[PDB]
Design a protein around this ligand. Sequence first.
Ligand code: HEM
Ligand code: HEM
Ligand code: HEM
Ligand code: HEM
Lengths: 146, 146, 142, 142
Amino acid sequence: VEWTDKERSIISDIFSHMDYDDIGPKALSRCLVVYPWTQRYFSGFGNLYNAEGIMSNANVAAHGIKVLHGLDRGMKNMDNIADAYTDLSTLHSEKLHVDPDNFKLLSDCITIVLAAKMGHAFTAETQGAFQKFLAAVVSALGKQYH
Amino acid sequence: VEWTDKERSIISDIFSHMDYDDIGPKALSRCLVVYPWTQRYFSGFGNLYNAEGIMSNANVAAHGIKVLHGLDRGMKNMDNIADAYTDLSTLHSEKLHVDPDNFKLLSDCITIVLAAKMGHAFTAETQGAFQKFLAAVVSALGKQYH
Amino acid sequence: SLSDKDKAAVRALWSKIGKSSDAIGNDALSRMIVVYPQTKIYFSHWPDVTPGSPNIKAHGKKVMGGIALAVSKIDDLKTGLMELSEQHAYKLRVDPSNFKILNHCILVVISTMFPKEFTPEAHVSLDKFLSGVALALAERYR
Amino acid sequence: SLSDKDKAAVRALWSKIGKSSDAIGNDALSRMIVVYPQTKIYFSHWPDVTPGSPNIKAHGKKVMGGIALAVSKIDDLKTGLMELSEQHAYKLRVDPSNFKILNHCILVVISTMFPKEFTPEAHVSLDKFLSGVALALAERYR
Ligand code: HEM
Ligand code: HEM
Ligand code: HEM
Ligand code: HEM
């Protein structure tokens, strides 16, 4: 993946205005409800969902903040995405046994939660650069799956 | 995509023993029947399918031979797949208007037709290197889609 | 398949946002074409394949009209969308793989437009619904 | 959905190849795990996750037993596979995205084993069928 300057500006702009403490938790909370099989990796935290069926565990949800900071790295050096995520890839695959498809599902959740917050500032071209970035990180995260 | 020596040997070995005049036509003929929307790009050749419903037009089928020779190029220099296919990508997108998803569908057809011919020589590890190669060509073919 | 919970969820959401279906469709089609430009091949017969072009705006109303019809036929989408399926399958020959791309764009638009309405719970049922929509639209293809 | 043409096509093929279902499943599971090694996470509790390992061979018979059951329930796969769906959804929590990966591997094995039987026409109906199988297996997931 190469990057135009406009894409670099868009992604930098998205992350500077992003409240990770809000976006992050909402996105993982949403993914655990829309793609419920993902709760398999947090099941041991216990006390995951509401009587009402919402994934109310702030602790588990707070992993979404770490995801977003995990995204910082690709964002900091977009010319090095693939090498940027080897230890993280190694970890989700070898220690966490996380299905890589789940990276796609969470990305989708991130995009939609971001969409809700930015509203009409989340233009087609913004969604475009942001999806393209997420894609590249996702791919890099599935590299150490052997 | 990087390549191990074993993968390089497997792919070279597959193409040296491949009868393009057989595999090629069978694979496109099969894809036009299993993924019938692909006939949209050949519809103008006319006389496409059998009363019996088979895609019997040798001419159209013979495009599968050109596909396989299109694969020669990536195979000849596997370290340059992405740059190898720019003019072909440009052509299927800008002149032919071909949906890139169709590249995936034909690849799948190719793999299965190859599978039928090689039989027990089409090992899991052979399928693996061959799919990985097809994937890389597919990706390179969708690059000039703008 | 959709549960009675899913159906209520989708009818209640639509009850709330259907008023904006023209803008939701304009916006959803624009996004698809910009974020997934390979889909423009199916629209290359239009003179303006640009976001919010008059062709895009007009077609956006039809798409969401089809989505209004799918809510209305939510108990039997195969039958409900049969004519739309035949259209896309034999007349237009659209690769059915593209349906989930527009569906994703519809979810993005609804979130931008109705953030407080498009809850995790609304999202899961609409997702299931849009998935059933794609499946019914694929009916006549092979 | 499957037409009467599709169903006959799938029952006639199975009628011909079911005799080899144990080898087809051994081979299909081995391929998935080697060509799509990320799927080994769902099998990492086995000591031998290698092609034709005794665990792989054994499980291969169950998978194709499930496929024999899907042919038998081909007129209503949702109901037919409901128990298998619940298994994969709540007990094992397998991402439903993986079903089409094994399905692809089943097609590859059948082609290698039954090249003259696995015609374009058999292939299109089996593809539609395996797709209906995945959809029914996804039933209990959300
Ligand atoms: C694709 C985007 C993702 C990114 C960038 C990401 C990043 C991270 C990071 C930075 C950590 C913490 C590592 C440390 O402690 O140094 C982590 C841990 C973890 N991740 Fe992810 N992750 C992603 C997706 C997922 C998905 C989709 C799942 C499962 C559905 C998942 C499951 C986990 C689990 C279970 C942990 C362990 C944390 C704990 O036990 O406290 N991750 N991930
Ligand atoms: C993904 C693998 C593919 C490869 C490597 C490939 C390669 C080629 C090549 C080498 C040509 C001939 C260009 C020339 O004349 O120099 C060609 C033409 C063409 N391709 Fe493909 N192709 C692929 C897939 C497809 C698919 C999936 C479709 C549509 C379903 C398609 C539709 C066409 C058409 C309509 C032509 C024009 C040929 C004619 O009119 O005689 N191709 N392709
Ligand atoms: C949510 C899924 C979709 C719905 C509900 C939908 C709905 C519709 C409707 C109601 C029409 C008008 C039918 C008529 O002319 O009588 C239409 C036409 C059309 N659709 Fe779709 N559509 C969907 C997805 C797609 C996708 C994914 C594509 C391709 C990327 C596509 C391509 C087209 C084209 C090219 C036309 C005809 C435009 C023209 O007449 O100039 N549709 N669609
Ligand atoms: C064609 C689709 C599939 C069919 C027909 C199928 C069939 C079966 C059957 C019959 C069982 C045994 C149920 C029981 O224990 O009572 C089973 C178990 C299992 N399946 Fe599947 N399966 C399919 C796809 C998959 C996929 C794609 C995966 C993951 C990649 C998967 C993962 C598992 C696992 C991990 C088990 C349990 C193994 C154990 O008990 O140690 N299945 N499957």
